[PDB]
């Protein structure tokens, strides 16, 4: 079996992306946010706190005929972010893009945190990380992809984010016209549970590349590209009067500026973050200060190759036995 559902940017700076997701039967669309950095699939459900539910999209185990509570099992979670959410757990048949899993682990909130409640567009997200991170206590479960993996024609996803755009997440095959070149794959390390590799080292612009190992994740619901400060200042050390900002929490630079590309190595090759992908846009309404899409990775202890880096590249995620991570120009 295979699965392509497109992802769409929930708004104009491609903060996120939302995949629709059916779930029950009869289906109750939801707009997920797929993470290669989590592995539980949680929603807004019925059982959400009303106060904490603000224009998404809710899940209603109760009208899906397909729905079992599990019964016992709860779950909590916290992200990098500062975000959390929780609550208790139902399986259910859950479709992305034509690929259903029955028996998929519907974590159901009832409680989350203001930046979820205040994202209308994102109605759940999709982990797409190793289920060894899945927090349903106290049987943990399988992530959306290790459910379908059997059933797939190959046991792969790949994410193909668009810039400004929709994109596209495959579920068990490999697009071969949805990129250039050659895909490179490269060892993932699965320790920490996530998409982890090493990129072979980084140029900024037009500048010579700099062969150096850096350790991160492939983090689809991470918006930007967070590695090692000497990493981060050589880039913004190339964009005039850009300036790291405590009061703002990273790197701004001025809306005026024109961004360098960043280039970041996969084994031998290459993928180019052209500089406008790099743009977040003014940290407040009319502010002519911009916020970077490259940020230190200093305050959390893992580099994060999240949208800004990915959407540059597609991106094969091969669940095979020994789970390794495809890049490729598009």
Do not use: M
Not at 56 to 70: D, E, G, N, R, V
């Amino acid at each position: 079996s295979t699965g392509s559902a497109t992802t769409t940017p929930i708004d104009s700076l491609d903060d996120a992306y939302i995949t629709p997701v059916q779930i029950g039967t009869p289906a109750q669309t939801l707009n997920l946010d797929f993470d290669t950095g989590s592995s539980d699939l949680w929603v807004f459900s019925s059982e959400t706190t009303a106060s904490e539910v603000d224009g998404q999209t809710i899940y209603t185990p109760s009208k899906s005929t397909t729905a079992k509570l599990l019964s016992g099992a709860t779950w909590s979670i916290s992200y990098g972010d500062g975000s959390s959410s929780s609550g208790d757990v139902y399986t259910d048949t859950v479709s992305v893009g034509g690929l259903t899993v029955t028996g998929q682990a519907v974590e159901s909130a009832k409680k989350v945190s203001s930046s979820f409640t205040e994202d209308s567009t994102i109605d759940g997200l999709l982990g797409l990380a190793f289920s060894t991170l899945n927090t349903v206590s106290p049987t943990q479960q399988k992530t959306f992809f290790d459910n379908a993996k059997a059933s797939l024609d190959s046991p792969v996803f790949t994410a193909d984010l668009g810039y400004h755009a929709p994109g596209t997440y495959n579920f068990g095959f490999i697009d071969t016209t949805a990129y250039t070149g050659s895909i490179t794959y490269t060892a993932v390390s699965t320790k920490q549970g996530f998409w982890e590799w090493t990129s072979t080292g980084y140029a900024v612009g037009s500048g010579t590349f700099k062969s150096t190992s850096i350790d991160g994740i492939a983090d689809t619901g991470t918006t930007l590209l967070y590695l090692p400060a000497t990493v981060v200042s050589a880039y913004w050390a190339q964009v005039s009067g850009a300036k790291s900002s405590s009061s703002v929490g990273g790197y701004v630079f001025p809306c005026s500026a024109t961004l360098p590309s960043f280039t970041f190595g996969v084994g031998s090759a290459r993928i180019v973050i052209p500089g406008d992908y790099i743009d977040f846009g003014p940290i407040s309404t009319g502010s002519s200060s911009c916020f970077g899409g490259i940020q230190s990775s200093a305050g959390i202890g893992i580099n994060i190759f999240g949208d800004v880096a990915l959407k540059a590249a597609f991106v094969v995620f091969n669940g095979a036995t020994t789970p390794t991570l495809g890049f490729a120009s598009k």
